[PDB]
């Protein structure tokens, strides 16, 4: 909805709700991982060489 | 390796393909000096006839072929491939000869 005469001041730098956005994306990232597998037995001694090139 | 005259024969030489390659085909009549046929994968120098089919170089995991069409008795020449791959090192020796025995 549109408004007439009323005039407010804004400030992007001390603005809030960006902080909770930065919290929420991190929390969503962490919630999207616990149903997936761990990679514990992979830390092991590797016998390595160069690829054929 | 033998087919009837006027026909096409299929001649392959060397390893399977790995990356983008450039092939070279040389021929040699017995008792004489060596001789060029095909310098790029499907390109031949001037003064040389057509009907020599080569393989494209883009195909991966294939073998280089050489198809001779409208053969004759003069085409009885020992053949030599020379491959250049972009993954393998430089081959300082030539490939294995595939002698043709014409009919």
């Amino acid at each position: 909805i549109h408004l007439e005469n009323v005039t407010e001041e804004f400030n992007m730098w001390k603005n809030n709700m960006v902080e909770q956005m930065h919290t929420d994306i991190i929390s969503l990232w962490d919630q999207s991982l616990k149903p997936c597998v761990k990679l514990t037995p992979l830390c092991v001694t590797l016998q390595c060489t160069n690829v054929t090139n | 390796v033998s087919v009837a005259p006027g026909q096409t024969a299929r001649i392959t030489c060397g390893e399977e393909s790995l990356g983008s390659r450039s092939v070279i085909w040389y021929q040699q009549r017995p008792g004489q000096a060596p001789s060029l046929i095909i310098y790029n994968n499907n390109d031949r120098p001037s003064g040389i006839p057509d009907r020599f089919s080569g393989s494209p170089g883009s195909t991966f995991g294939t073998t280089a072929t050489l198809t001779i069409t409208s053969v004759e008795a003069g085409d009885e020449a020992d053949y030599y491939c020379h491959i250049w791959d972009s993954r393998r090192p430089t081959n300082w020796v030539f490939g294995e000869g595939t002698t043709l025995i014409v009919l």
Partner: protein, 43 residues
Amino acid sequence: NITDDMRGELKNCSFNMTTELRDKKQKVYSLFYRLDVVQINSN
């Protein structure tokens, strides 16, 4: 310098433990009180 009739309140033990990898294993030592270890049953 222990008197024979008094008993040690500290025991000194060494054992095996897995390292960060799975293949290596190491020998390490530590201290414990007598009220935490018991005798399994020469050596």
